[PDB]
Symmetry: C4
Subunit: 114 residues, 4 copies
Protein backbone atom coordinates (compact mmCIF):
# COMPACT_ATOMS: atom_id res chain seq x y z
CA UNK A 1 0.00 0.00 0.00
CA UNK A 2 2.80 2.41 0.93
CA UNK A 3 6.56 1.88 0.53
CA UNK A 4 7.41 5.15 2.27
CA UNK A 5 7.29 3.81 5.83
CA UNK A 6 8.73 0.47 4.73
CA UNK A 7 11.65 2.52 3.43
CA UNK A 8 12.02 4.52 6.62
CA UNK A 9 11.85 1.32 8.71
CA UNK A 10 14.57 -0.40 6.69
CA UNK A 11 16.81 2.66 7.14
CA UNK A 12 16.11 2.97 10.85
CA UNK A 13 16.59 -0.76 11.57
CA UNK A 14 19.94 -0.53 9.77
CA UNK A 15 21.08 2.58 11.61
CA UNK A 16 20.10 0.95 14.91
CA UNK A 17 22.05 -2.17 14.12
CA UNK A 18 18.98 -4.43 14.15
CA UNK A 19 19.74 -5.52 10.58
CA UNK A 20 23.03 -5.26 8.65
CA UNK A 21 21.58 -3.75 5.44
CA UNK A 22 18.20 -2.29 4.44
CA UNK A 23 17.63 -4.56 1.42
CA UNK A 24 17.66 -7.26 4.05
CA UNK A 25 14.59 -5.82 5.79
CA UNK A 26 12.39 -5.63 2.72
CA UNK A 27 12.75 -8.72 0.49
CA UNK A 28 13.65 -11.18 3.29
CA UNK A 29 11.42 -14.27 3.50
CA UNK A 30 11.58 -14.20 7.29
CA UNK A 31 8.03 -14.62 8.66
CA UNK A 32 8.53 -11.79 11.18
CA UNK A 33 9.71 -9.39 8.51
CA UNK A 34 7.07 -10.50 6.04
CA UNK A 35 4.34 -9.61 8.51
CA UNK A 36 6.12 -6.37 9.46
CA UNK A 37 6.17 -5.24 5.82
CA UNK A 38 2.54 -6.20 5.41
CA UNK A 39 1.82 -4.25 8.59
CA UNK A 40 3.51 -1.12 7.29
CA UNK A 41 1.71 -1.39 3.93
CA UNK A 42 -1.64 -1.66 5.73
CA UNK A 43 -4.15 1.16 5.35
CA UNK A 44 -7.03 -0.23 7.43
CA UNK A 45 -7.07 -1.40 11.08
CA UNK A 46 -8.31 -4.85 10.08
CA UNK A 47 -5.22 -5.54 7.99
CA UNK A 48 -2.98 -3.86 10.51
CA UNK A 49 -4.25 -5.83 13.50
CA UNK A 50 -4.15 -9.01 11.39
CA UNK A 51 -0.54 -8.36 10.47
CA UNK A 52 0.53 -7.45 14.01
CA UNK A 53 -1.01 -10.72 15.27
CA UNK A 54 1.01 -12.56 12.62
CA UNK A 55 4.17 -10.67 13.60
CA UNK A 56 3.86 -11.70 17.25
CA UNK A 57 3.24 -15.37 16.44
CA UNK A 58 6.15 -15.38 13.95
CA UNK A 59 8.46 -13.85 16.55
CA UNK A 60 7.44 -16.44 19.15
CA UNK A 61 7.99 -19.31 16.71
CA UNK A 62 11.42 -18.16 15.47
CA UNK A 63 12.66 -17.67 19.04
CA UNK A 64 11.28 -21.09 19.99
CA UNK A 65 13.25 -22.71 17.12
CA UNK A 66 16.51 -21.11 18.26
CA UNK A 67 15.94 -22.18 21.84
CA UNK A 68 15.20 -25.70 20.56
CA UNK A 69 18.50 -25.71 18.65
CA UNK A 70 20.25 -25.00 21.92
CA UNK A 71 18.25 -27.73 23.58
CA UNK A 72 19.47 -30.26 21.02
CA UNK A 73 23.07 -29.18 21.57
CA UNK A 74 22.61 -29.65 25.31
CA UNK A 75 21.29 -33.17 24.81
CA UNK A 76 24.30 -34.06 22.67
CA UNK A 77 26.66 -32.66 25.36
CA UNK A 78 24.82 -34.52 28.11
CA UNK A 79 25.05 -37.89 26.40
CA UNK A 80 28.65 -37.21 25.41
CA UNK A 81 29.70 -36.54 29.02
CA UNK A 82 27.76 -39.64 30.13
CA UNK A 83 29.47 -41.84 27.53
CA UNK A 84 32.85 -40.40 28.61
CA UNK A 85 32.26 -41.12 32.29
CA UNK A 86 31.40 -44.72 31.53
CA UNK A 87 34.47 -45.19 29.33
CA UNK A 88 36.50 -43.80 32.21
CA UNK A 89 34.75 -46.16 34.64
CA UNK A 90 35.46 -49.20 32.49
CA UNK A 91 39.10 -48.15 32.06
CA UNK A 92 39.74 -47.34 35.73
CA UNK A 93 38.32 -50.73 36.72
CA UNK A 94 40.57 -52.44 34.17
CA UNK A 95 43.55 -50.51 35.53
CA UNK A 96 42.89 -51.42 39.17
CA UNK A 97 42.77 -55.02 37.92
CA UNK A 98 46.08 -54.74 36.09
CA UNK A 99 47.58 -53.28 39.26
CA UNK A 100 46.71 -56.26 41.44
CA UNK A 101 47.82 -58.69 38.71
CA UNK A 102 51.11 -56.80 38.69
CA UNK A 103 51.55 -56.82 42.48
CA UNK A 104 50.82 -60.56 42.53
CA UNK A 105 53.26 -61.25 39.71
CA UNK A 106 55.76 -59.39 41.91
CA UNK A 107 54.99 -61.65 44.87
CA UNK A 108 56.57 -64.57 42.99
CA UNK A 109 59.88 -62.85 43.63
CA UNK A 110 59.57 -62.68 47.41
CA UNK A 111 62.09 -64.60 49.47
CA UNK A 112 59.55 -65.00 52.27
CA UNK A 113 55.98 -66.33 52.27
CA UNK A 114 57.34 -69.44 50.61
CA UNK B 1 -16.94 -13.87 15.01
CA UNK B 2 -15.25 -14.31 11.62
CA UNK B 3 -13.44 -17.40 10.32
CA UNK B 4 -12.33 -15.65 7.13
CA UNK B 5 -9.19 -14.05 8.57
CA UNK B 6 -8.53 -17.07 10.78
CA UNK B 7 -8.51 -19.04 7.53
CA UNK B 8 -6.19 -16.62 5.78
CA UNK B 9 -3.84 -16.60 8.79
CA UNK B 10 -3.61 -20.39 8.92
CA UNK B 11 -2.77 -20.45 5.20
CA UNK B 12 -0.20 -17.67 5.46
CA UNK B 13 1.51 -19.12 8.57
CA UNK B 14 1.79 -22.42 6.70
CA UNK B 15 3.17 -20.89 3.53
CA UNK B 16 5.71 -18.94 5.60
CA UNK B 17 6.84 -22.05 7.40
CA UNK B 18 5.74 -20.80 10.84
CA UNK B 19 3.50 -23.86 11.24
CA UNK B 20 3.64 -27.18 9.37
CA UNK B 21 -0.09 -27.42 8.53
CA UNK B 22 -3.06 -25.02 8.77
CA UNK B 23 -5.28 -27.31 10.87
CA UNK B 24 -2.50 -26.90 13.39
CA UNK B 25 -3.07 -23.14 13.65
CA UNK B 26 -6.79 -23.30 14.34
CA UNK B 27 -7.68 -26.11 16.77
CA UNK B 28 -4.36 -26.13 18.68
CA UNK B 29 -4.66 -25.70 22.46
CA UNK B 30 -1.52 -23.58 22.53
CA UNK B 31 -2.21 -20.46 24.63
CA UNK B 32 -0.55 -18.19 22.04
CA UNK B 33 -2.65 -19.59 19.23
CA UNK B 34 -5.81 -19.62 21.31
CA UNK B 35 -5.47 -15.90 21.93
CA UNK B 36 -4.50 -15.27 18.29
CA UNK B 37 -7.70 -16.96 17.08
CA UNK B 38 -9.74 -15.05 19.60
CA UNK B 39 -8.01 -11.89 18.39
CA UNK B 40 -8.88 -12.56 14.76
CA UNK B 41 -12.51 -13.35 15.66
CA UNK B 42 -12.78 -10.06 17.56
CA UNK B 43 -15.09 -7.36 16.22
CA UNK B 44 -14.63 -4.69 18.92
CA UNK B 45 -11.41 -3.03 20.17
CA UNK B 46 -12.08 -4.14 23.74
CA UNK B 47 -11.96 -7.81 22.79
CA UNK B 48 -9.11 -7.24 20.39
CA UNK B 49 -6.90 -5.41 22.89
CA UNK B 50 -7.82 -8.01 25.53
CA UNK B 51 -6.78 -10.82 23.22
CA UNK B 52 -3.55 -9.14 22.11
CA UNK B 53 -2.60 -8.66 25.79
CA UNK B 54 -3.23 -12.37 26.32
CA UNK B 55 -1.19 -13.26 23.23
CA UNK B 56 1.86 -11.34 24.48
CA UNK B 57 1.72 -12.87 27.97
CA UNK B 58 1.25 -16.37 26.48
CA UNK B 59 4.25 -15.86 24.19
CA UNK B 60 6.42 -14.69 27.10
CA UNK B 61 5.40 -17.67 29.24
CA UNK B 62 5.96 -20.34 26.55
CA UNK B 63 9.41 -18.92 25.74
CA UNK B 64 10.23 -18.81 29.46
CA UNK B 65 9.34 -22.52 29.80
CA UNK B 66 11.63 -23.50 26.93
CA UNK B 67 14.49 -21.45 28.34
CA UNK B 68 13.87 -23.12 31.72
CA UNK B 69 14.09 -26.55 30.08
CA UNK B 70 17.51 -25.59 28.81
CA UNK B 71 18.43 -24.34 32.25
CA UNK B 72 17.59 -27.72 33.77
CA UNK B 73 19.72 -29.49 31.17
CA UNK B 74 22.61 -27.18 32.01
CA UNK B 75 22.32 -27.98 35.70
CA UNK B 76 22.41 -31.71 34.96
CA UNK B 77 25.53 -31.23 32.77
CA UNK B 78 27.21 -29.10 35.42
CA UNK B 79 26.72 -31.64 38.20
CA UNK B 80 27.69 -34.46 35.86
CA UNK B 81 31.03 -32.83 34.98
CA UNK B 82 31.62 -32.09 38.68
CA UNK B 83 30.93 -35.70 39.67
CA UNK B 84 33.28 -36.86 36.88
CA UNK B 85 36.12 -34.60 38.00
CA UNK B 86 35.88 -35.91 41.54
CA UNK B 87 35.85 -39.54 40.39
CA UNK B 88 38.95 -38.72 38.38
CA UNK B 89 40.54 -37.05 41.41
CA UNK B 90 39.88 -40.04 43.64
CA UNK B 91 41.24 -42.42 40.99
CA UNK B 92 44.37 -40.41 40.18
CA UNK B 93 45.20 -40.21 43.89
CA UNK B 94 44.73 -43.98 44.21
CA UNK B 95 46.99 -44.50 41.19
CA UNK B 96 49.80 -42.29 42.50
CA UNK B 97 49.56 -44.41 45.66
CA UNK B 98 49.78 -47.68 43.76
CA UNK B 99 52.82 -46.30 41.95
CA UNK B 100 54.82 -45.64 45.11
CA UNK B 101 53.76 -49.00 46.58
CA UNK B 102 55.07 -50.54 43.37
CA UNK B 103 58.38 -48.67 43.40
CA UNK B 104 58.90 -49.65 47.04
CA UNK B 105 58.08 -53.29 46.36
CA UNK B 106 60.77 -53.01 43.66
CA UNK B 107 63.29 -51.67 46.18
CA UNK B 108 63.29 -55.07 47.92
CA UNK B 109 65.18 -56.32 44.88
CA UNK B 110 68.04 -53.84 45.09
CA UNK B 111 71.52 -55.20 45.72
CA UNK B 112 72.52 -51.94 47.42
CA UNK B 113 70.92 -49.98 50.26
CA UNK B 114 71.02 -53.17 52.27
CA UNK C 1 -10.60 1.11 36.00
CA UNK C 2 -12.34 -2.24 35.41
CA UNK C 3 -11.71 -5.53 37.22
CA UNK C 4 -14.11 -7.45 34.98
CA UNK C 5 -11.64 -8.17 32.17
CA UNK C 6 -8.79 -8.58 34.66
CA UNK C 7 -10.96 -11.29 36.20
CA UNK C 8 -11.70 -12.96 32.89
CA UNK C 9 -8.00 -12.85 31.93
CA UNK C 10 -6.89 -14.48 35.18
CA UNK C 11 -9.44 -17.26 34.64
CA UNK C 12 -8.50 -17.78 31.00
CA UNK C 13 -4.73 -17.76 31.65
CA UNK C 14 -5.32 -20.40 34.33
CA UNK C 15 -7.52 -22.59 32.15
CA UNK C 16 -4.93 -22.37 29.37
CA UNK C 17 -2.14 -23.39 31.68
CA UNK C 18 -0.23 -20.11 31.28
CA UNK C 19 -0.39 -19.55 35.05
CA UNK C 20 -1.06 -22.10 37.81
CA UNK C 21 -3.68 -20.06 39.72
CA UNK C 22 -5.64 -16.85 39.01
CA UNK C 23 -4.59 -15.00 42.17
CA UNK C 24 -1.15 -15.32 40.66
CA UNK C 25 -2.12 -13.23 37.62
CA UNK C 26 -3.51 -10.29 39.53
CA UNK C 27 -1.36 -9.39 42.57
CA UNK C 28 1.97 -10.63 41.14
CA UNK C 29 4.78 -8.04 41.11
CA UNK C 30 6.02 -9.34 37.77
CA UNK C 31 6.63 -6.36 35.46
CA UNK C 32 4.89 -8.10 32.54
CA UNK C 33 1.81 -8.84 34.60
CA UNK C 34 1.81 -5.42 36.22
CA UNK C 35 1.63 -3.78 32.81
CA UNK C 36 -0.95 -6.31 31.61
CA UNK C 37 -3.25 -5.47 34.52
CA UNK C 38 -2.75 -1.77 33.93
CA UNK C 39 -3.53 -2.41 30.26
CA UNK C 40 -6.79 -4.17 31.06
CA UNK C 41 -7.83 -1.42 33.51
CA UNK C 42 -7.19 1.22 30.84
CA UNK C 43 -10.14 3.17 29.46
CA UNK C 44 -8.33 5.50 27.04
CA UNK C 45 -5.98 4.65 24.13
CA UNK C 46 -3.18 6.74 25.63
CA UNK C 47 -3.03 4.60 28.76
CA UNK C 48 -3.59 1.44 26.78
CA UNK C 49 -0.80 2.08 24.28
CA UNK C 50 1.46 3.20 27.15
CA UNK C 51 0.79 -0.02 29.01
CA UNK C 52 1.23 -2.25 25.96
CA UNK C 53 4.62 -0.59 25.30
CA UNK C 54 5.57 -1.35 28.90
CA UNK C 55 4.36 -4.95 28.55
CA UNK C 56 6.57 -5.57 25.50
CA UNK C 57 9.68 -4.08 27.11
CA UNK C 58 9.03 -6.05 30.34
CA UNK C 59 8.66 -9.28 28.35
CA UNK C 60 11.91 -8.63 26.47
CA UNK C 61 13.80 -7.89 29.69
CA UNK C 62 12.54 -10.94 31.64
CA UNK C 63 13.40 -13.26 28.73
CA UNK C 64 16.83 -11.63 28.45
CA UNK C 65 17.49 -12.32 32.16
CA UNK C 66 16.62 -16.00 31.80
CA UNK C 67 18.81 -16.36 28.74
CA UNK C 68 21.62 -14.63 30.68
CA UNK C 69 21.21 -17.15 33.52
CA UNK C 70 21.79 -19.90 31.00
CA UNK C 71 24.78 -18.03 29.65
CA UNK C 72 26.35 -17.95 33.12
CA UNK C 73 25.78 -21.68 33.53
CA UNK C 74 27.48 -22.28 30.20
CA UNK C 75 30.51 -20.25 31.24
CA UNK C 76 30.82 -22.27 34.45
CA UNK C 77 30.61 -25.55 32.45
CA UNK C 78 33.16 -24.31 29.93
CA UNK C 79 35.74 -23.39 32.55
CA UNK C 80 35.02 -26.59 34.46
CA UNK C 81 35.71 -28.78 31.40
CA UNK C 82 38.86 -26.74 30.69
CA UNK C 83 40.14 -27.16 34.24
CA UNK C 84 39.40 -30.90 34.02
CA UNK C 85 41.31 -31.33 30.76
CA UNK C 86 44.36 -29.64 32.22
CA UNK C 87 44.25 -31.77 35.38
CA UNK C 88 44.09 -34.78 33.09
CA UNK C 89 47.01 -33.45 31.04
CA UNK C 90 49.17 -32.92 34.12
CA UNK C 91 48.30 -36.39 35.43
CA UNK C 92 48.85 -38.24 32.15
CA UNK C 93 52.26 -36.59 31.79
CA UNK C 94 53.14 -37.61 35.35
CA UNK C 95 52.02 -41.17 34.59
CA UNK C 96 54.08 -41.48 31.39
CA UNK C 97 57.01 -40.34 33.55
CA UNK C 98 56.35 -42.94 36.23
CA UNK C 99 56.18 -45.56 33.49
CA UNK C 100 59.66 -44.86 32.15
CA UNK C 101 61.08 -44.63 35.70
CA UNK C 102 59.53 -48.05 36.27
CA UNK C 103 60.89 -49.60 33.06
CA UNK C 104 64.35 -48.25 33.89
CA UNK C 105 64.21 -49.56 37.44
CA UNK C 106 63.39 -52.90 35.79
CA UNK C 107 66.47 -52.66 33.57
CA UNK C 108 68.67 -53.04 36.67
CA UNK C 109 67.52 -56.65 36.72
CA UNK C 110 68.64 -57.53 33.20
CA UNK C 111 71.33 -60.16 32.81
CA UNK C 112 72.49 -58.54 29.57
CA UNK C 113 73.48 -54.96 28.74
CA UNK C 114 75.91 -55.17 31.62
CA UNK D 1 6.34 14.97 20.98
CA UNK D 2 5.71 14.48 24.72
CA UNK D 3 8.28 13.74 27.43
CA UNK D 4 5.63 13.35 30.12
CA UNK D 5 4.84 9.68 29.44
CA UNK D 6 8.48 8.96 28.61
CA UNK D 7 9.20 10.27 32.10
CA UNK D 8 6.51 8.18 33.73
CA UNK D 9 7.69 5.07 31.86
CA UNK D 10 11.30 5.51 32.95
CA UNK D 11 10.13 5.85 36.57
CA UNK D 12 7.81 2.86 36.39
CA UNK D 13 10.35 0.59 34.65
CA UNK D 14 12.82 1.49 37.40
CA UNK D 15 10.39 0.88 40.24
CA UNK D 16 9.46 -2.48 38.68
CA UNK D 17 13.08 -3.51 38.40
CA UNK D 18 13.01 -3.74 34.59
CA UNK D 19 15.85 -1.21 34.38
CA UNK D 20 18.33 -0.18 37.09
CA UNK D 21 17.99 3.61 36.63
CA UNK D 22 15.62 5.88 34.68
CA UNK D 23 18.33 7.75 32.73
CA UNK D 24 19.01 4.31 31.32
CA UNK D 25 15.54 4.08 29.76
CA UNK D 26 15.66 7.38 27.92
CA UNK D 27 19.07 8.00 26.29
CA UNK D 28 19.98 4.32 25.75
CA UNK D 29 20.86 3.39 22.15
CA UNK D 30 19.12 0.04 22.53
CA UNK D 31 16.87 -0.52 19.48
CA UNK D 32 13.97 -1.70 21.67
CA UNK D 33 14.17 1.36 23.88
CA UNK D 34 14.69 3.70 20.95
CA UNK D 35 11.44 2.52 19.40
CA UNK D 36 9.67 2.60 22.77
CA UNK D 37 10.61 6.26 23.27
CA UNK D 38 9.54 7.07 19.74
CA UNK D 39 6.29 5.23 20.46
CA UNK D 40 5.60 7.27 23.59
CA UNK D 41 6.40 10.54 21.78
CA UNK D 42 3.95 9.62 19.00
CA UNK D 43 0.80 11.69 18.59
CA UNK D 44 -0.74 9.96 15.55
CA UNK D 45 -1.64 6.27 15.04
CA UNK D 46 0.59 6.03 11.97
CA UNK D 47 3.70 6.87 13.96
CA UNK D 48 2.54 4.82 16.90
CA UNK D 49 1.85 1.66 14.89
CA UNK D 50 5.13 2.21 13.01
CA UNK D 51 7.04 2.44 16.27
CA UNK D 52 5.31 -0.56 17.86
CA UNK D 53 6.20 -2.65 14.77
CA UNK D 54 9.81 -1.54 15.20
CA UNK D 55 9.72 -2.36 18.92
CA UNK D 56 8.57 -5.94 18.27
CA UNK D 57 11.20 -6.58 15.59
CA UNK D 58 13.93 -5.06 17.81
CA UNK D 59 12.87 -7.27 20.72
CA UNK D 60 12.93 -10.38 18.53
CA UNK D 61 16.39 -9.53 17.16
CA UNK D 62 18.00 -8.77 20.55
CA UNK D 63 16.65 -12.01 22.04
CA UNK D 64 17.87 -13.92 18.98
CA UNK D 65 21.40 -12.51 19.49
CA UNK D 66 21.50 -13.61 23.12
CA UNK D 67 20.27 -17.08 22.24
CA UNK D 68 22.95 -17.22 19.52
CA UNK D 69 25.62 -16.31 22.08
CA UNK D 70 24.52 -19.30 24.10
CA UNK D 71 24.60 -21.43 20.98
CA UNK D 72 28.23 -20.48 20.36
CA UNK D 73 29.13 -21.37 23.94
CA UNK D 74 27.48 -24.75 23.49
CA UNK D 75 29.47 -25.45 20.35
CA UNK D 76 32.72 -24.63 22.16
CA UNK D 77 31.74 -26.98 25.04
CA UNK D 78 30.77 -29.73 22.62
CA UNK D 79 34.07 -29.65 20.74
CA UNK D 80 35.98 -29.34 24.01
CA UNK D 81 34.38 -32.50 25.45
CA UNK D 82 35.01 -34.29 22.14
CA UNK D 83 38.68 -33.30 22.10
CA UNK D 84 38.97 -34.44 25.74
CA UNK D 85 37.45 -37.85 25.05
CA UNK D 86 39.87 -38.45 22.21
CA UNK D 87 42.87 -37.41 24.31
CA UNK D 88 41.64 -39.87 26.92
CA UNK D 89 41.23 -42.56 24.27
CA UNK D 90 44.75 -42.08 22.96
CA UNK D 91 46.16 -42.12 26.50
CA UNK D 92 44.22 -45.17 27.69
CA UNK D 93 45.37 -47.10 24.62
CA UNK D 94 48.97 -46.07 25.31
CA UNK D 95 48.58 -47.18 28.93
CA UNK D 96 47.17 -50.61 28.07
CA UNK D 97 50.22 -50.95 25.81
CA UNK D 98 52.65 -49.99 28.56
CA UNK D 99 50.95 -52.54 30.80
CA UNK D 100 51.56 -55.48 28.48
CA UNK D 101 55.14 -54.32 27.82
CA UNK D 102 55.57 -54.30 31.59
CA UNK D 103 54.06 -57.76 32.14
CA UNK D 104 56.27 -59.15 29.38
CA UNK D 105 59.38 -57.52 30.80
CA UNK D 106 58.38 -59.28 34.04
CA UNK D 107 58.18 -62.64 32.26
CA UNK D 108 61.96 -62.54 31.74
CA UNK D 109 62.22 -63.17 35.47
CA UNK D 110 60.17 -66.37 35.52
CA UNK D 111 61.91 -69.56 36.57
CA UNK D 112 59.51 -71.60 34.42
CA UNK D 113 58.54 -71.32 30.75
CA UNK D 114 62.23 -71.44 29.96
C1 LIG E 1 -3.58 -5.63 17.12
C2 LIG E 1 -2.51 -6.60 17.09
HG1 LIG E 1 -3.28 -8.37 16.55
C1 LIG F 1 -3.65 -3.70 22.61
C2 LIG F 1 -2.88 -4.87 22.95
HG1 LIG F 1 -3.32 -5.36 24.85
C1 LIG G 1 0.31 0.33 21.23
C2 LIG G 1 1.28 -0.49 21.92
HG1 LIG G 1 2.70 0.72 22.67
C1 LIG H 1 0.38 -1.60 15.75
C2 LIG H 1 1.65 -2.22 16.06
HG1 LIG H 1 2.73 -2.29 14.37
CA1 LIG I 1 19.32 -20.96 25.91
Amino acid sequence: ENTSSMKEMATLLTSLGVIQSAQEFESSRDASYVFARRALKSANYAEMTFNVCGLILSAEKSSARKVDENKQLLKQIQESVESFRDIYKRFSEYQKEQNSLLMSNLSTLHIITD
